[PDB]
Structure formats: structure tokens, C-alpha cells
Design a protein around this ligand. Structure first.
Ligand SMILES: Cc1cc(CC(=O)N2CCC[C@H](C(N)=O)C2)ccn1
Ligand SMILES: [Zn+2]
Length: 139
């Protein structure tokens, strides 16, 4: 679990969105596994606006942060699950590292701020849904 709080927005994995998230929906994209809902309280997370390929992610299944090198956002095939059939997930970045399904929502950060959130895994690769292109999260 986990989310990004920036301004009046809450960014979560779409497959983990709550009833309140859908009742206050701003934007959602199934192909990216992202959903953004509105909030009453102001958020203070900073979104990175960069092309970094190195950062640190929080892994709840180990209560640890790990430094990783990750690929640029791209279309990657993701196996079927109870939330989606087999498809290509867009804007996804991969790194060599540990993750379990419950790690989704963990933040990936670089020196400039929040890069994305844990969204996929398996076979020793962790995938993160990028948020750096969503310039409207700041305005
Ligand atoms: C972080 C993680 C997730 C899994 C499982 C995984 O990849 N799923 C299941 C949940 C939805 C995901 C998606 N974005 O389509 C795909 C296994 C290890 N680590
Ligand atoms: Zn950066």
C-alpha cells in the first residue's frame, strides 16, 4: 500500500483505489495502473521533473529502502492478475530488486523528488509507475 500527496491530489495504484478515491476521481488510466483522487487537506510531496535513471525505493516486505538503477518509462508486458488480464502497461520503469504484491504504493525517489510508485514485480524485477510526466499534479 502507499500513495503520493501533492497539492489537492492523492496518487495511488489504480488496482488499490478505495470507494472514496473513485467518488472523488480526477483522472485514472488502467494502462498505467494509476488513479488520482482529490483531497481536502494540502499535500507536501515534491514531484521530480527530470530524466534520472537512479534512485531509492521503499520496500515494505523488508522494512528497507534500496538504491536501484531503473529503465526509462516504456510499454512492458505484464502477466494477468485478478485486477487485469495480460496486457502492456505503459509508462513503467524496471529495476533489479525485491518486491512482493503488498509492496505496491512504495515510493521511488531521486535527488529531485518523487519519481513514481511500485506497481509490478516478479522474477527479481520491480516495476514502478512513472509520475514525472504528469505536469498538472503541480498546478
Ligand atoms: C510489486 C509486486 C507486484 C506483484 C504482482 C504484480 O506484478 N501484479 C499484480 C497486481 C497488479 C499489477 C499490475 N500493475 O498490473 C501486477 C508481484 C511482486 N511484486
Ligand atoms: Zn531526478
Amino acid at each position: 500500500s502507499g500513495a503520493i500527496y501533492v497539492g489537492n491530489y492523492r496518487v495511488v495504484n489504480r488496482h488499490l483505489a478505495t470507494h472514496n478515491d473513485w467518488a472523488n476521481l480526477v483522472w485514472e488510466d488502467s494502462s498505467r495502473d494509476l488513479l488520482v483522487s482529490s483531497t481536502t487537506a494540502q499535500g507536501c510531496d515534491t514531484i521530480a521533473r527530470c530524466d534520472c535513471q537512479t534512485g531509492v525505493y521503499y520496500c515494505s516486505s523488508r522494512r528497507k529502502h534500496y538504491p536501484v538503477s531503473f529503465s526509462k518509462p516504456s510499454l512492458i508486458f505484464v502477466e494477468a492478475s485478478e485486477y487485469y488480464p495480460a496486457r502492456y502497461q505503459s509508462h513503467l520503469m524496471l529495476a533489479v530488486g525485491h518486491s512482493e504484491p503488498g509492496d505496491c504504493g512504495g515510493i521511488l525517489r531521486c535527488q529531485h523528488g518523487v519519481v513514481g510508485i511500485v506497481s509490478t514485480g516478479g522474477n527479481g524485477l520491480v516495476g514502478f509507475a512513472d509520475v514525472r510526466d504528469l505536469l498538472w499534479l503541480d498546478e
